[PDB]
Ligand SMILES: Nc1nc2c(ncn2[C@@H]2O[C@H](COP(=O)(O)OP(=O)(O)OP(O)(O)=S)[C@@H](O)[C@H]2O)c(=O)[nH]1
């Protein structure tokens with residue numbers, strides 16, 4: 110009756126967002142106290158995002174659309190400290206707001222594949238007025254959108270379909286992957302997450318190795334690990350919503366030079382699915398249960414997880 114699910118995957122593939130979904134779906138979601146706890150993370154993610162674009166503008170040599178933004182940018186650092194403490198003055202919000210609307214800033218934002226930027230940058234920045242209002246309390250989506258690198262082993266429990274689930278989540282960054290082996294015992298099923306949107310990105314840890322190629326190496330390792338022969342391997346080709354948006358303006362050939370299909374979601378998605386499933390060295394004896402997901406979308410995850418559970422039995 111107990112089921113141990115181990116979430117694996119490279120950095121920022123969406124493993125922890127899936128864990129938060131289990132809370133939203135199988136419990137009653139984040140309470141007011143828990144949401145308030147996330148208020149400091151939302152604000153630091155937001156400042157972190159705008160500072161990242163402003164930093165990038167310096168390296169890439171992009172000017173502000175209006176010279177006036179220069180002192181707004183300086184006023185940003187003077188007031189940024191407040192943010193991580195969980196406070197957002199109308200003045201700071203005003204400063205971020207004006208910065209986010211600048212064409213030079215927007216020009217740099219659109220070049221975000223050239224540097225590291227929070228996936229939820231536009232989500233928070235576009236909702237500045239809401240998140241900055243007095244007595245703001247994060248909504249479940251706000252919590253789902255927060256980014257905090259995972260270190261250590263986070264364990265979560267929930268009951269679904271009469272089964273007692275014990276879900277384990279670990280971090281995907283270099284230092285943390287070395288510690289995955291500590292969770293290899295008694296795993297009922299592994300949900301390996303992959304950010305489909307990584308195809309045109311370099312690692313936060315390196316820039317000559319394509320993030321998806323790294324994801325492929327990790328999957329090749331796990332999937333084929335004989336220790337995992339009787340463990341169901343579920344593959345979540347995640348961030349399908351960002352992939353759909355990217356495929357229209359960024360060639361999949363960057364990652365896979367041999368790709369002949371068109372820049373359409375359906376064709377490119379199927380191609381990546383095949384790339385990963387092809388790594389399975391025992392296709393007739395081992396089945397990989399693939400699902401396309403958008404971790405932040407509760408409904409998608411709810412139906413996908415219901416499906417995965419039926420597979421687990
Ligand atoms: N738009 C969008 N954002 C997503 C999706 N899945 C995850 N995210 C966002 O991506 C960021 C990273 O997600 P997270 O769950 O922290 O990744 P992780 O794999 O758990 O990363 P780590 O813990 O190894 S470093 C978070 O801000 C989360 O809200 C998705 O499908 N769509």
Ligand SMILES: [Mg+2]
Pocket residue numbers: 124125126257258259278279280281
């Ligand atoms: Mg995590």
